[PDB]
Subunit: 284 residues, 2 copies
Amino acid sequence: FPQLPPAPDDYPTFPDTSTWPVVFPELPAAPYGGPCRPPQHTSKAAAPRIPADRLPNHVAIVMDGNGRWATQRGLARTEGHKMGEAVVIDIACGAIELGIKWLSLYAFSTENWKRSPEEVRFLMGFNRDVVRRRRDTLKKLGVRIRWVGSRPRLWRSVINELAVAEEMTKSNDVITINYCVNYGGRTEITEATREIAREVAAGRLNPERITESTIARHLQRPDIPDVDLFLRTSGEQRSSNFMLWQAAYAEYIFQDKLWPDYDRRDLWAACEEYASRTRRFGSA
Amino acid sequence: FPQLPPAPDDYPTFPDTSTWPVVFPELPAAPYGGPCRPPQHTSKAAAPRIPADRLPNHVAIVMDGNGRWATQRGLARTEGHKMGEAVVIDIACGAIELGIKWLSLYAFSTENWKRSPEEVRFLMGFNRDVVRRRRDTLKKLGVRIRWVGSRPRLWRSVINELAVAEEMTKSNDVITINYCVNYGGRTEITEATREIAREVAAGRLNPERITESTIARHLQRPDIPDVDLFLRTSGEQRSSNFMLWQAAYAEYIFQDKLWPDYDRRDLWAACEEYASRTRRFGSA
């Protein structure tokens, strides 16, 4: 089984949401060694034994309910998103422990521009900072992260920090994260159709030998496999333009828990649900 | 509202499951009315009087569980699909009673070629028959029925029974069933893109002017509105590649009931659930 073994009782925990930004624990040194073990949850729960063959290769997660988490408390929408950064990194430490290879996170879509300039301006600058703050934590843990999304109208500063983050981690392989910012499904499929029309213009491609693979090879990030499990948080039941191509044959699981009330044990609950189930016909 | 007021006491009931193929009720005249009103259910039950503003103008359905039903009672899979035929027509009648105008249907799938050559060689002949038999019923109900699928492998004979039923109901417009046979969410994108490529290579379209609108236009039927309500039965929480592009922001409602037990009242259940939900499209 691929799960790391339950952290020693005395290993640092995460998150300590008394401070903010939550402080990521100084972890023990390695012998060494290479990738550090991720701190254990504050509850010290341990990953569930699941064969590598019953696991989702690729968990896509639609974070949901930060704005609404704040609002039931008399707070500004945007403060909930701040309790979200800790849950992100938590779930990340959970997937590593669990033995998960690909994790997609829907930070911001091509449709979140509809919201107020006050919230759009907060999210843009909070993704920028988050990235810079976490690049070295994520790096050390075995994570390979990079920006997945569309370029039109996206704060340049977000594209930069993540290409810094891509350069540091383009050789890590404990797990891969696709940090989706200004991501739209149709927009990404649109981006590739001209990746294609462009080659056809360079007569470097036959328009009658075009396959689903041909399209899949011209998406922004072409090594992103199909999405096995589609977590969507806070009771909402929709994909919302997330991994449209990739998540076609995805199995859906909708948790009713607001994202900031979320933690890695929740990720493990769902994944178990997925693995323990009898794979039906045609079902991978 | 826009639903049809209740059908009188002694109105024709559907279905009468005392035979196979089940027989369709001799429907009252209505001169000088236009189309013939949809028969009421066998329970003579009432349609929900939902607001027009909480109606799913476009409801797509992945009719699942047809062969499990049969398996349960020591039957071969063929006999399950047979009883699900009268389910469709009955489900088409309730959509009209409820005032829905766009109904999609996953009759067959590109995925469906990996089923036994026996079961598949049967699923091609049954659909052809159903169009040939039921298309006159639908003609009178105001149903505009057409084909939506890839051609390769698809029996010519199926396509042409829908090219005939389409040509007969082209000016009808109480509802519009898109009968999907050999449908592939990606397969339809792929094909919209083969078109784009050709035009681009013929010198009639410049790669840098391709937008989402352009893909939306090069689809097989580019008039299909986005999908509002995405139903699937059996207990399967998957889009499984249905209306992939259309259903980007659709509301997934899932149920356990297998298709051959499914009847209109259950379709009305679904739309009340979609009715209570808040759709936001990237809005706060």
